[PDB]
Amino acid sequence: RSRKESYSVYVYKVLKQVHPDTGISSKAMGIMNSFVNDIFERIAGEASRLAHYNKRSTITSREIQTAVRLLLPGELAKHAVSEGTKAVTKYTSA
Amino acid sequence: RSRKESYSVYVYKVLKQVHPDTGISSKAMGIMNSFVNDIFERIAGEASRLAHYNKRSTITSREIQTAVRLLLPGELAKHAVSEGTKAVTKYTSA
Amino acid sequence: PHRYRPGTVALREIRRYQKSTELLIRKLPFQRLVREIAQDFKTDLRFQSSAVMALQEACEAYLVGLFEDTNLCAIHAKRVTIMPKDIQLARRIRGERA
Amino acid sequence: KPHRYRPGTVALREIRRYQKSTELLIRKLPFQRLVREIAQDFKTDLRFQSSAVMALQEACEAYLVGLFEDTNLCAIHAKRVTIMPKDIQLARRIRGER
Amino acid sequence: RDNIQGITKPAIRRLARRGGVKRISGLIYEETRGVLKVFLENVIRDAVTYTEHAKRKTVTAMDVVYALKRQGRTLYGFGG
Amino acid sequence: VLRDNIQGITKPAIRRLARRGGVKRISGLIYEETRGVLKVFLENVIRDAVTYTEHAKRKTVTAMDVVYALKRQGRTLYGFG
Amino acid sequence: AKAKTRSSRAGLQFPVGRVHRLLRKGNYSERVGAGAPVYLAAVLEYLTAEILELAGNAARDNKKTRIIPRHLQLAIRNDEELNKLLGRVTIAQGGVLPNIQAVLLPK
Amino acid sequence: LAGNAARDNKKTRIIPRHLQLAIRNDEELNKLLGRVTIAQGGVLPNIQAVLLPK
DNA sequence: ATCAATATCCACCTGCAGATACTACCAAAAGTGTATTTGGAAACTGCTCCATCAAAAGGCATGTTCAGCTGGAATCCAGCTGAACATGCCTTTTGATGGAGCAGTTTCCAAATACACTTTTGGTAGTATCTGCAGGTGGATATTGAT
């Protein structure tokens, strides 16, 4: 009884959102899982470093915002920052 | 007004061991501190990764040994491994 | 009899192999080479199939990138033939020799 | 009737002189003004420590020296001794910066 | 044990055609064989280190993925 | 404000930087080219540095921010901490 | 009772207790063994002694008695394994290695 | 991006080749993922101008 | 083969910034000693995937030939870069000043941890169903290359 968690169903939801009638193979889905894991580890490592530099003991939204700004370029950084900010305000105001 | 720890005195002891009558400037000592900190963080990060891969919760001597082997090349790896092993046996047998 | 001029089949092959995604080395020779190389670090190792597949993907990507760099170093000297000194320059600049 | 060195002599002498030394090769004040101008383009009303601008200077000089070495290699590859912009572009492309 | 001549000359020429090369010297084949053997032993050393640290005898795909990632050559697709 | 300071990197300074790199003969078009390169480099570091400074809610750029930026771009620097 | 420290127990010069504390506080794992700081201290001391011996030989070669960053750079760049361990670091006030291509020389 | 590539090659199902074509053809993605290898991805069709005939 | 003009190295000297050093102290830390808890080593076992043959079958590699075209060597020349001198200008050093911002001190309170409980829910395994696509076949045409 050994499981194996993955982001397959969430990637599938996003795909059905942006392309309602296109599918995806299994190897492309493995590529997408690898991509999500890689970017997650990058952002989390950078935020941990930022928290250590300032002698803080907590990872908050500002650490994630600054890590996003340090990692993504230009268009990507701007739009990701806007998306995350909107998400956090929508979450707290609910 | 808070103190600032460093490896100055230990580097000085090692120097007086290998070169009994040579001194060292202050900028070279800052270089040596930077070097020690950098190598320490490299080894410790690699050992942490190794411990996470095997779903272990403890950093032991084997993790440090494998990190040393993964980071240093050839001569350096061999001699560092021998030195650390001798140190650990000398420590436990005392 | 019909004969193409030297260089036509070359560009035809270039387009063909840049349109494709296959592997360009045979699998059994690469497997034997990998096992023989691993023979010196430890004896009696086993390999999953996906391990050798990953090794092959990585090696082919590396070599194709190196060949692009070599082609640039060749064109820089006003040639079209790649020579070993172009490979050596590309690797020296990348830092793989230095 | 006055003494003149042949072209390339003072250049080799200067090569030895500047490879034997460790000083900085850019004036401090122009570099500091340049750094402050760029920073102002990024965020207004900034301040700087002295060691920060010194670190920036050391890093930038090391970068440019390494780039010039790679450029020299690319130039010699083409059977020249004069470095030209296309060599800088080839070096920066093989390195992976453009 | 010439398993390095298993990488035939037409195979290297195919690899060169994919990289956009239009003409190939005759001394290129030995050079690429040397380069490839260097790269391969560099990767397999760390793969076998990762393996024997875990006290296993079978080299897994994840060991190769880690050995590649530590060289700065991340590889997507075999993360399972 | 201050504008047009890239010209303070004079031709003799670039010639010296090239001498330390082993370069014997220099084209006349190199200087301009070089300046561009340098500017790009600085803009990539200072930005990162400033991103650290605003994170701590500071207003002065310290040497540690520069060292962190250089390290995160793979250009580690020993001597300043 | 009488308290002898850990670095003396292991026969080292570097601090074992400080390395233990740095391994704990640095957030690397949730537990830390007893021999890990000893191993790490021994490795760090070995590397420092290696690089310092090379730098001192360089310094005594240039007829000086006190090491400066130039000597550290000359030691690092002249050894294969050190230069390949530290291939991507910049040493402030270090300079470069004297080296001119053969084709640029006269004759 | 990958779906646009897939629909461009008259297909209905994304494969790794389409992911590679999407990544390599965009500046910011190619510069974010500049050092990754996608298995079964291939390369971008591109021949130097000097190698063409005439 | 010679000579003469320039630049570099070395012996001598000295002023001074820097390394070595107590003294004090002092606060922060490392070591000892228990008690508790839990993660990891040993043992067993099941079952899955890796190594080894067997064995056609045909697609790819190898050796050979011929010829074309490319790389390299040799002249030749012009323009572009180096070397040197005169001028001036702007960087550097030293000192002083204002003062803005950083770092330490204290409060306190909003927010994150730790447990116990309950409800989904996403992931494995069959089990099943359907169909987008890779492989095969025919026919049009786009391109090359010698006349």
Coordinates of N, CA, C and O in Angstrom, one line a residue, chain A residues 20-94:
Chain A
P20 N -10.0 24.3 -23.7 CA -11.1 23.4 -23.2 C -11.1 22.0 -23.8 O -11.7 21.1 -23.2
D21 N -10.6 21.8 -25.0 CA -10.8 20.6 -25.7 C -9.5 19.9 -26.2 O -9.5 19.0 -27.0
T22 N -8.4 20.4 -25.7 CA -7.1 19.7 -26.0 C -6.7 18.8 -24.8 O -7.0 19.1 -23.7
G23 N -6.1 17.7 -25.2 CA -5.6 16.8 -24.2 C -4.1 16.8 -24.0 O -3.4 17.7 -24.5
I24 N -3.5 15.9 -23.3 CA -2.1 15.8 -23.0 C -1.6 14.4 -22.8 O -2.4 13.6 -22.3
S25 N -0.4 14.1 -23.3 CA 0.1 12.7 -23.2 C 0.6 12.5 -21.8 O 0.5 13.3 -20.9
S26 N 1.1 11.3 -21.5 CA 1.6 10.9 -20.2 C 3.0 11.4 -20.0 O 3.4 11.9 -18.9
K27 N 3.8 11.4 -21.1 CA 5.2 11.9 -20.9 C 5.2 13.4 -20.7 O 6.0 14.0 -20.0
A28 N 4.3 14.2 -21.4 CA 4.2 15.6 -21.2 C 3.8 15.9 -19.8 O 4.2 16.9 -19.2
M29 N 2.9 15.0 -19.2 CA 2.5 15.3 -17.9 C 3.6 15.0 -16.9 O 3.7 15.7 -15.9
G30 N 4.5 14.0 -17.2 CA 5.7 13.9 -16.3 C 6.6 15.1 -16.4 O 7.2 15.5 -15.4
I31 N 6.7 15.6 -17.6 CA 7.5 16.9 -17.8 C 6.9 18.0 -16.9 O 7.7 18.7 -16.3
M32 N 5.6 18.1 -16.9 CA 5.0 19.2 -16.2 C 5.2 19.0 -14.7 O 5.4 20.0 -13.9
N33 N 5.1 17.8 -14.2 CA 5.4 17.5 -12.8 C 6.8 17.9 -12.4 O 7.0 18.5 -11.4
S34 N 7.7 17.5 -13.3 CA 9.1 17.9 -13.0 C 9.3 19.4 -12.9 O 10.0 19.9 -12.1
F35 N 8.6 20.1 -13.9 CA 8.7 21.5 -13.9 C 8.2 22.2 -12.6 O 8.8 23.0 -12.0
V36 N 7.0 21.7 -12.2 CA 6.4 22.3 -11.0 C 7.3 22.0 -9.7 O 7.5 23.0 -8.9
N37 N 7.8 20.8 -9.6 CA 8.7 20.5 -8.5 C 9.9 21.4 -8.5 O 10.3 21.9 -7.5
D38 N 10.5 21.5 -9.7 CA 11.8 22.3 -9.8 C 11.5 23.8 -9.4 O 12.3 24.3 -8.6
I39 N 10.5 24.4 -9.9 CA 10.2 25.8 -9.6 C 9.9 26.0 -8.1 O 10.3 27.0 -7.5
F40 N 9.1 25.0 -7.6 CA 8.8 25.1 -6.1 C 10.0 25.1 -5.3 O 10.2 25.9 -4.4
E41 N 11.0 24.2 -5.6 CA 12.2 24.1 -4.8 C 13.0 25.4 -4.9 O 13.6 25.9 -3.9
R42 N 13.1 25.9 -6.1 CA 13.8 27.2 -6.3 C 13.3 28.3 -5.4 O 14.0 28.9 -4.7
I43 N 12.0 28.5 -5.5 CA 11.4 29.6 -4.8 C 11.5 29.4 -3.3 O 11.8 30.3 -2.5
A44 N 11.3 28.2 -2.8 CA 11.4 27.9 -1.4 C 12.8 28.0 -0.8 O 13.0 28.6 0.3
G45 N 13.8 27.6 -1.6 CA 15.1 27.8 -1.2 C 15.5 29.2 -1.1 O 16.1 29.7 -0.1
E46 N 15.1 30.0 -2.1 CA 15.5 31.5 -2.0 C 14.8 32.2 -0.8 O 15.4 33.0 -0.2
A47 N 13.5 31.8 -0.6 CA 12.8 32.4 0.6 C 13.5 32.0 1.9 O 13.5 32.8 2.8
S48 N 13.9 30.8 2.0 CA 14.6 30.4 3.2 C 15.9 31.2 3.4 O 16.2 31.6 4.5
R49 N 16.7 31.4 2.3 CA 17.9 32.2 2.5 C 17.5 33.6 2.9 O 18.2 34.1 3.8
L50 N 16.5 34.2 2.3 CA 16.1 35.6 2.7 C 15.7 35.6 4.1 O 16.1 36.6 4.8
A51 N 15.0 34.6 4.6 CA 14.6 34.6 6.0 C 15.9 34.5 6.9 O 15.9 35.1 8.0
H52 N 16.9 33.7 6.5 CA 18.1 33.6 7.3 C 18.9 34.8 7.4 O 19.5 35.2 8.4
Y53 N 19.0 35.6 6.2 CA 19.8 36.8 6.2 C 19.3 37.8 7.2 O 20.1 38.5 7.8
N54 N 18.0 38.0 7.3 CA 17.4 39.0 8.2 C 17.2 38.5 9.6 O 16.6 39.2 10.4
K55 N 17.7 37.3 10.0 CA 17.5 36.8 11.3 C 16.1 36.7 11.7 O 15.7 36.8 12.9
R56 N 15.2 36.3 10.7 CA 13.8 36.1 11.0 C 13.6 34.6 11.1 O 14.4 33.8 10.5
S57 N 12.6 34.2 11.8 CA 12.3 32.7 12.0 C 11.1 32.3 11.3 O 10.7 31.1 11.4
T58 N 10.4 33.1 10.5 CA 9.1 32.8 9.8 C 9.2 33.1 8.4 O 9.8 34.1 8.0
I59 N 8.6 32.3 7.5 CA 8.5 32.5 6.1 C 7.1 33.1 5.9 O 6.1 32.4 6.2
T60 N 7.0 34.3 5.4 CA 5.8 35.0 5.2 C 5.6 35.3 3.7 O 6.3 34.9 2.9
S61 N 4.5 36.1 3.4 CA 4.3 36.5 2.0 C 5.3 37.4 1.4 O 5.6 37.4 0.2
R62 N 6.0 38.2 2.3 CA 7.0 39.1 1.7 C 8.2 38.3 1.3 O 8.9 38.7 0.3
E63 N 8.6 37.3 2.0 CA 9.7 36.4 1.5 C 9.4 35.8 0.2 O 10.3 35.8 -0.7
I64 N 8.2 35.3 0.0 CA 7.8 34.7 -1.3 C 7.8 35.7 -2.4 O 8.2 35.5 -3.5
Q65 N 7.3 36.9 -2.1 CA 7.3 38.0 -3.1 C 8.7 38.4 -3.5 O 8.9 38.5 -4.7
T66 N 9.6 38.5 -2.6 CA 11.0 38.9 -2.9 C 11.7 37.8 -3.7 O 12.4 38.0 -4.6
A67 N 11.4 36.5 -3.3 CA 12.0 35.4 -4.0 C 11.5 35.3 -5.4 O 12.3 35.1 -6.4
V68 N 10.2 35.6 -5.6 CA 9.6 35.6 -7.0 C 10.3 36.7 -7.8 O 10.7 36.5 -9.0
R69 N 10.5 37.9 -7.2 CA 11.1 39.0 -7.9 C 12.6 38.7 -8.2 O 13.1 39.1 -9.3
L70 N 13.3 37.9 -7.4 CA 14.7 37.6 -7.6 C 14.8 36.5 -8.6 O 15.9 36.4 -9.3
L71 N 13.8 35.7 -8.8 CA 14.0 34.5 -9.7 C 13.4 34.8 -11.1 O 14.0 34.4 -12.1
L72 N 12.2 35.4 -11.2 CA 11.6 35.4 -12.5 C 12.0 36.8 -13.2 O 12.3 37.8 -12.5
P73 N 12.1 36.8 -14.5 CA 12.4 38.0 -15.2 C 11.2 38.8 -15.7 O 10.3 38.3 -16.3
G74 N 11.3 40.1 -15.5 CA 10.4 41.1 -16.2 C 8.9 40.8 -16.2 O 8.2 40.9 -15.2
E75 N 8.4 40.5 -17.4 CA 7.0 40.1 -17.6 C 6.5 39.1 -16.6 O 5.5 39.3 -15.9
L76 N 7.3 38.0 -16.5 CA 6.9 36.9 -15.6 C 6.9 37.4 -14.2 O 5.9 37.1 -13.4
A77 N 7.9 38.1 -13.7 CA 7.9 38.6 -12.3 C 6.7 39.5 -12.0 O 6.0 39.3 -11.0
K78 N 6.4 40.5 -12.9 CA 5.3 41.4 -12.7 C 4.0 40.7 -12.6 O 3.2 40.9 -11.7
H79 N 3.7 39.8 -13.6 CA 2.4 39.1 -13.6 C 2.3 38.1 -12.5 O 1.2 38.0 -11.9
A80 N 3.3 37.4 -12.1 CA 3.2 36.5 -11.0 C 3.0 37.3 -9.7 O 2.2 36.8 -8.8
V81 N 3.7 38.4 -9.5 CA 3.5 39.2 -8.3 C 2.0 39.7 -8.2 O 1.4 39.6 -7.2
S82 N 1.5 40.1 -9.3 CA 0.1 40.6 -9.3 C -0.9 39.5 -9.0 O -1.8 39.6 -8.2
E83 N -0.6 38.3 -9.6 CA -1.5 37.1 -9.4 C -1.5 36.7 -7.9 O -2.5 36.5 -7.3
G84 N -0.3 36.6 -7.3 CA -0.2 36.2 -5.9 C -0.8 37.2 -5.0 O -1.5 36.8 -4.0
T85 N -0.6 38.5 -5.2 CA -1.2 39.5 -4.4 C -2.7 39.4 -4.4 O -3.4 39.4 -3.4
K86 N -3.3 39.3 -5.6 CA -4.7 39.2 -5.7 C -5.2 38.0 -5.0 O -6.2 38.0 -4.2
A87 N -4.5 36.9 -5.1 CA -4.9 35.6 -4.4 C -4.9 35.9 -2.9 O -5.9 35.5 -2.2
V88 N -3.9 36.5 -2.3 CA -3.8 36.7 -0.9 C -4.9 37.6 -0.4 O -5.5 37.4 0.7
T89 N -5.2 38.7 -1.1 CA -6.3 39.6 -0.6 C -7.6 38.9 -0.7 O -8.5 39.0 0.2
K90 N -7.8 38.1 -1.8 CA -9.1 37.4 -1.9 C -9.2 36.4 -0.8 O -10.3 36.1 -0.3
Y91 N -8.1 35.8 -0.3 CA -8.1 34.8 0.7 C -8.4 35.4 2.1 O -9.3 34.9 2.8
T92 N -7.7 36.5 2.4 CA -7.9 37.1 3.7 C -9.3 37.8 3.8 O -9.9 37.8 4.9
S93 N -9.8 38.4 2.8 CA -11.0 39.1 2.8 C -12.2 38.2 2.9 O -13.4 38.7 3.0
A94 N -12.0 36.9 2.7 CA -13.1 35.9 2.8 C -13.3 35.4 4.2 O -12.4 35.5 5.0

